[PDB]
Design a protein around this ligand. Structure first.
Ligand SMILES: C=CC1=C(C)[C@@H](Cc2[nH]c(/C=C3N=C(/C=C4\NC(=O)[C@H](C)[C@H]4CC)C(C)=C\3CCC(=O)O)c(CCC(=O)O)c2C)NC1=O
Ligand SMILES: C=CC1=C(C)[C@@H](Cc2[nH]c(/C=C3N=C(/C=C4\NC(=O)[C@H](C)[C@H]4CC)C(C)=C\3CCC(=O)O)c(CCC(=O)O)c2C)NC1=O
Ligand SMILES: C=CC1=C(C)[C@@H](Cc2[nH]c(/C=C3N=C(/C=C4\NC(=O)[C@H](C)[C@H]4CC)C(C)=C\3CCC(=O)O)c(CCC(=O)O)c2C)NC1=O
Ligand SMILES: C=CC1=C(C)[C@@H](Cc2[nH]c(/C=C3N=C(/C=C4\NC(=O)[C@H](C)[C@H]4CC)C(C)=C\3CCC(=O)O)c(CCC(=O)O)c2C)NC1=O
Ligand SMILES: C=CC1=C(C)[C@@H](Cc2[nH]c(/C=C3N=C(/C=C4\NC(=O)[C@H](C)[C@H]4CC)C(C)=C\3CCC(=O)O)c(CCC(=O)O)c2C)NC1=O
Ligand SMILES: CCC1=C(C)/C(=C/C2=NC(=C\c3[nH]c(/C=C4\NC(=O)[C@H](C)[C@H]4CC)c(C)c3CCC(=O)O)/C(CCC(=O)O)=C2C)NC1=O
Ligand SMILES: CCC1=C(C)/C(=C/C2=NC(=C\c3[nH]c(/C=C4\NC(=O)[C@H](C)[C@H]4CC)c(C)c3CCC(=O)O)/C(CCC(=O)O)=C2C)NC1=O
Ligand SMILES: CCC1=C(C)/C(=C/C2=NC(=C\c3[nH]c(/C=C4\NC(=O)[C@H](C)[C@H]4CC)c(C)c3CCC(=O)O)/C(CCC(=O)O)=C2C)NC1=O
Ligand SMILES: CCC1=C(C)/C(=C/C2=NC(=C\c3[nH]c(/C=C4\NC(=O)[C@H](C)[C@H]4CC)c(C)c3CCC(=O)O)/C(CCC(=O)O)=C2C)NC1=O
Ligand SMILES: CCC1=C(C)/C(=C/C2=NC(=C\c3[nH]c(/C=C4\NC(=O)[C@H](C)[C@H]4CC)c(C)c3CCC(=O)O)/C(CCC(=O)O)=C2C)NC1=O
Ligand SMILES: CCC1=C(C)/C(=C/C2=NC(=C\c3[nH]c(/C=C4\NC(=O)[C@H](C)[C@H]4CC)c(C)c3CCC(=O)O)/C(CCC(=O)O)=C2C)NC1=O
Ligand SMILES: CCC1=C(C)/C(=C/C2=NC(=C\c3[nH]c(/C=C4\NC(=O)[C@H](C)[C@H]4CC)c(C)c3CCC(=O)O)/C(CCC(=O)O)=C2C)NC1=O
Ligand SMILES: CCC1=C(C)/C(=C/C2=NC(=C\c3[nH]c(/C=C4\NC(=O)[C@H](C)[C@H]4CC)c(C)c3CCC(=O)O)/C(CCC(=O)O)=C2C)NC1=O
Lengths: 162, 164, 160, 161, 172, 26, 92, 98, 160, 162
């Protein structure tokens, strides 16, 4: 779990020493930034079903073959359209977890680690999820440093898929 | 039935001896070679109506003159008998693979064939156009195994060498 | 299902269920996990199993779709594929019920009276289900294709 | 005459739709209890005569329906009871396996209370016999299996009332 | 790790005995099987990706509670570790098929695998379902002709089913 | 099952050990 | 089920024909007999042939053979066409 | 419904079995018990048997209890064989008249 | 067996065997290896399963062996255990046949007529088979004891 | 490079001993199979342009969006079409190298090491290259053990892509 709190503890514990001001300053920067981070976590949560149902539609309009091809990997039946919107709500739920914790720690273990073995095995294309994450970036409707904290964890997910 | 048994019990019977070790050894060859030649007896049996269909029309595609009046394949009944005869020659090859030698061919199809094909005015070159088409339609590891294609072809062109 | 007619069998005979009947209700319910996976494959492949099903049906029976055929025009051809969607649905019921009892009393009992009374060639609709069978068994492994194909050919048998 | 799978297929078929996640969700719930029902129906088949002997001796053995004038006096009338109680313990076993009480009203409940009124059979003593028979059935098959077999006994008692 | 030929020699050396003539002929017919054994190993490794990803897809359809939030195979890393264990077991079973002996399979794949899954909390009865789904997916792929000559492979496919059953009881 | 832990299966040293000098495997 | 549950005298179902037929028995006879009606002269129904030869099952030959003599019939010949003899299992 | 008993129309049209045999085998069939046995009660099954295998209704009360106890103990295969093997069947129909 | 009555079922119905019938003949023959092991356990345990079977039978029913009981003396007690050896043998047949069809037409059909006609208390012989069941299921694991005990209690049900 | 010859040398040089009959038989079996493999490589070479033009067209039929969508990753323009017939010829040439050498060595050193890194970066889908390889497995026209050797290295590349 990459938190700013736990990266400070692991830095002091690599050399067997107490928490100095090198570490208390690192966890000070979590608390100054936590005001803008915790307001983005409520705004992305409160408009989640608008963003999940909107971004699932954004993939079908860019990739129309995913609703036409036969196979278990595509969203042509109702089973595949339900497993598509499940994944978009997995990506949105990880982003709000990172804004709550402070660092890119929840989506490292729960989302990114092991992901490209899954997309290669189950024949899922990572360009579908980039297009869905591009929709949430342009449509959360936030502004200021609330938007900059949210756009950073969205862009962190886009770089892992690309 | 000229076979591997009926040469070692026809030569021993004319000699008046028991089946010695020279004749038990010959039927040990009837266990190793017959693993392959029954596979060509089984693929030919399960696909016989498509082989003769693919082979019997090559008699008429090569020699198109048979459907002229006065010739051999002139009407409906004589065309069906011409496809019947290639089914016969494909049946005795299935009988020869399961016997072990050329027994059912030298007694049942070959012997007397040069006297009926001259009397009934059948062209015997039209028969070997159908059998040699079957030898060259044979893909060796697709139709059967590698060895079963040797056994099936070696009775086929023996039948060609009989008719020509 | 196997549960309901193993009961009504032993029901008529004034007796309970033997080990031969209760070791198969037992054997069927442990089979139930694998049955739902098989029916789940055919459930959201009806777009490809029906449309490719009517693919080979018209290539093999152009009379039924040609002018004069029963399924001629934009109208009847839509209903021409509607029945295949029906029979593909009943096969999903038979796979989950472990028997053609759902297919029996739906789409099989008195089917010749309907299609004879509709002017439809009953042999033609039998050809349609066979074309769906090759598409269905091509979507599953060998262990499953011995089942999903197994219910189609029963429907082929009763439909002629 | 529908089991749990037949009832699930019927409702999913009657709307013309496939077996969605909710229809298969109940079917998976039935297959989970498939192991419990057979063992429940196993022991009930073994102790059929013992269960009925326990119920009548515990509910209506010595009451004055058993004595002269009561509804169960003559040996033909007494013998009809254990014949009659055998169906309730038997058909309840079928409902426990099929997981659906459709077989009961199809083959037991219809014309039943209308028949006992004709013969003059006391419906009050009948239900208490089935209640006592339900009590001993929970002894054999256990608690949850008794909950399953017991769920169809009171279904008979409710409709027979 | 010793194959089927060295298993006979290892038993004879503890007796101090030469191999008798009825033991050499039992080993000369293992050579005669030969090409049929390498055809089985070629068919289960050429399709080795398809055996795992189809049997996994058919395992969460029957048991959907594994991929719900709170299930043992819900995340990216826990799903990839599920497909990883199935490829390891399938790898070592094909090692025991080319050897003719299950020695390499339980030396370095099955020792402590049961106690590993108890420590992690992985349901070992559901892991055994996945081994059996890989079993018949590769048994059915062993006895189809598709480029092989026609013959009897029935004793070797029964041998391959025994390795999948040994791995499925050594896991729970 | 398998061999015990560490024992290479098939290279056991107690295969044809005499009983008079056999030592029980811990 | 079968006709030998425990029924005999003094039992609730009436004392009747009890056959030694197993569960779903598959043995059947080939019988031949005449059976004059002996009741047409006060009923005046139409007449039917009384000489019949038919395959009766083992499950109900005894009842039929017990009844054919009830109405004065005579059994000319019977055989066991289908089924084994002294067969413990397999009559089903 | 396009039903078919080809084996029974075989063995009756040749005369291998009587009409009474063909009628009894029809009664123990499964297309029968799915029709007139499963949806009804053993009480109602007894009366529906008389309309079919005897062409008349029950006559008395004791004629019920004799035939209910048989169906009570042997089911459909025990009841229809007890009607086809009665004397009242034979007096009206023996082996040839439907 | 399950093979013979799954046939005679589909035989009477003028039809072939469904997948529900042919996926169980298939499922039964793969079960055949495990059935012979179970019957092999009871085969050479008849010395203990019968002798301990009559152990609890006399402790629970001393009347039948006491003077006046049906199995009184050195003679009847030997035959008293002979019948248990019979019924223990038929259970080995039912386990291998996968059904009580062998037990049905041997030792069950008309059994009440025999024992009533021999003067033997039929309830007493039912108590004997139950005592054998506890000895038999004590010799096998839980997965097997649900079968070997399963055939005894059917014999208990039909024997009263 | 992985070869039946070089893997026998490397397993004796690791132990530090001379080439025994354990190693002389592993290279004897390479020489028995070499006649089937060299006829399979002479036939795949002489019909390469037929197999290259056909396999690329077989991908544009299954995935028609690859000739439609704009961007650098897709075969929409004539430049992206030329870079696709070059990729099929790379996959086909490594198969004929593996038949000549006698093992899965040339396609390890040249194609499959680093393959999942260059696919994810340039946003290529491995399902495009599988369908290009299923065509060559169905259209090389080989028979028997000649086709067993060719389809063994085609099936090896499909396992790395999936
Ligand atoms: C050219 C001469 C020639 C022969 C003489 C036989 C020799 C022969 N017999 C058997 C082999 C055998 N022979 C028997 C026969 C018997 N065993 C008995 O206990 C019975 C007394 C007797 C039966 C009649 C059996 C049971 C086997 C082993 C099973 C078998 O291989 O069929 C085998 C196979 C095993 C082996 O390698 O030895 C061979 C080659 N075959 C030949 O090609
Ligand atoms: C028992 C004996 C037996 C055989 C000998 C074959 C013979 C055979 N092959 C084909 C049919 C075929 N045979 C081949 C094979 C080849 N085509 C060639 O030109 C190459 C020489 C060779 C590659 C190995 C092909 C590719 C077809 C299908 C297309 C065609 O007819 O050529 C047909 C026509 C019916 C069919 O489609 O199968 C027949 C009779 N089948 C048999 O049952
Ligand atoms: C035991 C093996 C066996 C055979 C090999 C055949 C050989 C054979 N063929 C024919 C008889 C015939 N065979 C042919 C065949 C042909 N004429 C043609 O147009 C083609 C050239 C050719 C077929 C490709 C025809 C047309 C007849 C009938 C001759 C006639 O009616 O005049 C007859 C005369 C009796 C008859 O069948 O009518 C016989 C013995 N029959 C056998 O029982
Ligand atoms: C290095 C690569 C390599 C392989 C992958 C194997 C594969 C292989 N198997 C066989 C040879 C064989 N292969 C089989 C196998 C089968 N037949 C069936 O019907 C079953 C489907 C299947 C069982 C798995 C049989 C039965 C033979 C014997 C040939 C015959 O008798 O026809 C041969 C040819 C031997 C010959 O004919 O001379 C080869 C190359 N061997 C190798 O050297
Ligand atoms: C001087 C006298 C003397 C002996 C009697 C033996 C006694 C003996 N037997 C075994 C060893 C054994 N003994 C048996 C015995 C049997 N197998 C069965 O299935 C039946 C129960 C029975 C055959 C009749 C078995 C299977 C083993 C192997 C145990 C194992 O490896 O797990 C061992 C362990 C060492 C070994 O692996 O051999 C010893 C000391 N050794 C001696 O030195
Ligand atoms: C919490 C972290 C997490 C992620 C990211 C995750 C992804 C994930 N998505 C999957 C499947 C899927 N994903 C999709 C989604 C899509 N296909 C399309 O065509 C659409 C365009 C797209 C929707 C955007 C489909 C259809 C499947 C089913 C594929 C199959 O079962 O073969 C699977 C395969 C197993 C399963 O069915 O559950 C995983 C593991 N799982 C996780 O636990
Ligand atoms: C679940 C079991 C079940 C079936 C099968 C079923 C069939 C069914 N098919 C119908 C019509 C039809 N069906 C066809 C079918 C065909 N034409 C062809 O050429 C082909 C051979 C064939 C299809 C493969 C046509 C053309 C009509 C319309 C006929 C008309 O308009 O006169 C109709 C009348 C219209 C309707 O209500 O749909 C019914 C009820 N109903 C059921 O409940
Ligand atoms: C399968 C569904 C089903 C049921 C339940 C059923 C019941 C039924 N119960 C009957 C009689 C009877 N039932 C009883 C029962 C009782 N007396 C008591 O005091 C108790 C309260 C009760 C026992 C629990 C008695 C005594 C008779 C005989 C009545 C008489 O002879 O007048 C009769 C009259 C005929 C006969 O028994 O042969 C029928 C038809 N029939 C069916 O088809
Ligand atoms: C000797 C060769 C060898 C094997 C086979 C092996 C297995 C092994 N499997 C593991 C985990 C795992 N194994 C599974 C597998 C499953 N869970 C399920 O729900 C499914 C039923 C099943 C397969 C589909 C899962 C989900 C984990 C991750 C457990 C966790 O991270 O909490 C772990 C824990 C470490 C890790 O995360 O990688 C080891 C060490 N280790 C070895 O050294
Ligand atoms: C009223 C005049 C009359 C008689 C006598 C009669 C006999 C008769 N005995 C039968 C069987 C039988 N009879 C026996 C008798 C015996 N086994 C022995 O070892 C003894 C020697 C003998 C006892 C004394 C047996 C064992 C069967 C059963 C045969 C079988 O299942 O194959 C059967 C076959 C059907 C059935 O029992 O349900 C009939 C019809 N029927 C009649 O209508
Ligand atoms: C289950 C065992 C069994 C068999 C086999 C059987 C046969 C049987 N075949 C019959 C007739 C027949 N069977 C045939 C058969 C043939 N004509 C030919 O040229 C051919 C050689 C042959 C067809 C292979 C014909 C034409 C009739 C009608 C005879 C007539 O109307 O006179 C009849 C007369 C009644 C009827 O068909 O309804 C019976 C009972 N019954 C059985 O219970
Ligand atoms: C395979 C099915 C089968 C059975 C079960 C069977 C039973 C059978 N039990 C018999 C006797 C007997 N059976 C008993 C039995 C008992 N006494 C008791 O107290 C106990 C309650 C009970 C045993 C547990 C006695 C005492 C006799 C001798 C009776 C006499 O001598 O009058 C006899 C007569 C003597 C003989 O031939 O053995 C038979 C045929 N035959 C069969 O074919
Ligand atoms: C010898 C081993 C080897 C391999 C495997 C290899 C693959 C490879 N393919 C590439 C590009 C490419 N590959 C494709 C191919 C396709 N896109 C489509 O639309 C089609 C569906 C599909 C072909 C059928 C395209 C269009 C590009 C250009 C992508 C770009 O420039 O961004 C690139 C990017 C570098 C470049 O521009 O050349 C590499 C490294 N290179 C190698 O040296």
């Amino acid at each position: 779990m990459k938190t700013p709190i736990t990266e400070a503890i692991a830095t002091a514990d690599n050399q067997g020493r107490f928490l100095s001001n090198t570490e208390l300053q690192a966890v000070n920067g979590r608390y100054q930034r936590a005001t803008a981070s915790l307001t983005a976590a409520k705004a992305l949560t409160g408009s989640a079903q608008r963003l999940i149902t909107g971004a699932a539609q954004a993939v079908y309009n860019k990739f129309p073959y995913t609703t036409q091809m036969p196979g278990p990997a595509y969203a042509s039946s109702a089973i595949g359209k339900a497993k598509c919107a499940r994944d978009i709500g997995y990506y949105l739920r990880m982003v709000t977890y990172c804004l709550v914790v402070g660092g890119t720690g929840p989506m490292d273990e729960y989302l990114v680690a092991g992901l490209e073995e899954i997309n290669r095995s189950f024949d899922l294309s990572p360009s579908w999820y980039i297009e869905a994450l591009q929709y949430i970036k342009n449509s959360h409707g936030l502004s200021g440093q609330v938007a900059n904290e949210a756009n950073a964890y969205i862009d962190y997910a886009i770089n892992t898929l690309s | 039935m000229k076979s591997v048994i009926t040469t070692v019990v026809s030569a021993a019977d004319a000699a008046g001896r028991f089946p010695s070790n020279s004749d038990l050894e010959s039927i040990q060859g009837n266990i190793q070679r017959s693993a392959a030649r029954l596979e060509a007896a089984e693929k030919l049996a399960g696909n016989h109506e498509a082989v003769v269909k693919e082979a019997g029309d090559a008699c008429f595609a090569k020699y198109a003159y048979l459907k002229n009046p006065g010739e051999a394949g002139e009407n409906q009944e004589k065309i069906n008998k011409c496809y019947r005869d290639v089914d016969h020659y494909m049946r005795l090859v299935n009988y020869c693979l399961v016997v072990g030698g050329t027994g059912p061919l030298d007694e049942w199809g070959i012997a007397g064939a040069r006297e009926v094909y001259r009397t009934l005015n059948l062209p015997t070159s039209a028969y070997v156009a159908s059998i040699a088409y079957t030898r060259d339609r044979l893909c060796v590891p697709r139709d059967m195994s590698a060895q079963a294609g040797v056994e099936f072809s070696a009775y086929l062109d023996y039948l060609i060498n009989a008719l020509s | 299902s196997i549960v309901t007619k193993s009961i009504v069998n032993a029901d008529a005979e004034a007796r309970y269920l033997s080990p031969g009947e209760l070791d198969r209700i037992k054997s069927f319910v442990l089979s139930g996990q694998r049955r739902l996976r098989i029916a789940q494959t055919l459930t959201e492949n009806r777009e490809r199993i029906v449309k490719q099903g009517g693919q080979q049906l018209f290539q093999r029976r152009p009379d039924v779709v040609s002018p004069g055929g029963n399924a001629y025009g934009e109208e009847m051809t839509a209903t021409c594929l509607r029945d295949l969607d029906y029979y593909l649905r009943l096969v999903t019921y038979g796979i989950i019920a472990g028997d053609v009892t759902p297919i029996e009393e739906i789409g099989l009992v008195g089917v010749k009276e309907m299609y004879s009374a509709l002017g439809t060639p009953i042999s033609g609709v039998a050809e349609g289900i066979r074309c769906m069978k090759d598409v269905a068994c091509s979507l599953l492994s060998g262990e499953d294709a011995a089942e999903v194909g197994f219910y189609f050919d029963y429907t082929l048998a009763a439909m002629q | 005459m529908q089991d749990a799978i037949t009832s699930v297929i019927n409702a999913a078929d009657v709307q013309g739709k496939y077996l969605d996640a909710n229809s298969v969700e109940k079917l998976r719930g039935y297959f989970q209890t498939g192991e419990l029902r057979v063992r429940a129906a196993a022991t009930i088949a073994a102790n059929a005569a013992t269960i009925i002997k326990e119920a009548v001796a515990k509910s209506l053995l010595y009451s004055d329906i058993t004595r002269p004038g009561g509804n169960m006096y003559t040996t033909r009338r007494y013998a009809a009871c254990i014949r009659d109680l055998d169906y309730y313990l038997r058909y309840a076993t079928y409902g426990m396996l099929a997981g659906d009480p459709s077989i009961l009203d199809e083959r037991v409940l219809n014309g039943l209370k209308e028949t006992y009124n004709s013969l003059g059979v006391p419906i009050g003593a009948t239900i208490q016999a089935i209640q006592a028979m339900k009590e001993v059935t929970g002894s054999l098959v256990g608690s949850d299996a008794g909950k399953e077999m017991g769920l169809y006994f009171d279904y008979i008692c409710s409709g027979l009332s | 790790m010793l194959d089927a030929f060295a298993k006979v020699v290892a038993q004879a050396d503890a007796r101090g005995e030469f191999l008798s003539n009825t033991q050499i002929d039992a080993l000369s017919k293992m050579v005669k099987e030969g090409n049929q054994r390498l055809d089985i190993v070629n068919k289960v490794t050429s399709n080795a990706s398809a055996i795992v990803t189809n049997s996994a897809r058919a395992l969460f359809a029957e048991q959907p509670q594994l991929i719900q939030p709170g299930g043992n195979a819900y995340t990216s890393r826990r799903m990839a570790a599920c497909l990883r264990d199935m490829e390891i077991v399938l790898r070592y079973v094909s090692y025991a098929m080319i050897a003719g002996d299950s020695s390499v399979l339980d030396d370095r794949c099955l020792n402590g695998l049961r106690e590993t899954y108890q420590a992690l909390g992985t349901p070992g009865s559901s892991v055994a379902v996945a081994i059996q789904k890989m079993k018949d997916a590769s048994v059915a792929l062993a006895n189809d002709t598709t480029g092989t000559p026609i013959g009897d492979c029935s004793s070797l496919v029964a041998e391959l089913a025994g390795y999948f059953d040994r791995a499925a009881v050594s896991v729970v | 099952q398998l061999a015990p832990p560490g024992i290479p299966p098939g290279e056991d040293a107690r295969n044809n050990q005499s009983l008079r000098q056999y030592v029980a495997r811990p | 089920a079968y006709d030998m549950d425990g029924t005999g005298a003094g039992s609730l179902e009436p004392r009747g024909i009890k056959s030694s037929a197993v569960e779903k028995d598959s043995r059947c006879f080939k019988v031949t007999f005449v059976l004059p009606s002996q009741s047409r002269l006060y009923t005046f129904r139409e007449l039917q042939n009384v000489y019949t030869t038919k395959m009766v099952p083992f499950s109900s030959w005894y009842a039929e053979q017990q009844r054919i003599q009830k109405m004065g019939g005579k059994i000319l010949k019977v055989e066991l066409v289908a089924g084994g003899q002294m067969r413990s299992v397999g009559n089903q | 419904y396009g039903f078919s008993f080809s084996v029974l129309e075989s063995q009756v049209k040749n005369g291998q079995i009587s009409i009474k045999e063909f009628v009894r085998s029809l009664g123990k069939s499964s297309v029968y018990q799915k029709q007139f046995y499963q949806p009804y009660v053993n009480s109602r099954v007894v009366e529906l048997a008389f309309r079919h295998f005897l062409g008349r209704n029950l006559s008395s009360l004791a004629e019920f209890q004799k035939f209910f106890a048989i169906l009570s103990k042997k089911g459909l295969t025990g009841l229809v064989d007890s009607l086809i093997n009665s004397r009242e069947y034979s007096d009206y129909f023996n082996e040839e008249t439907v």
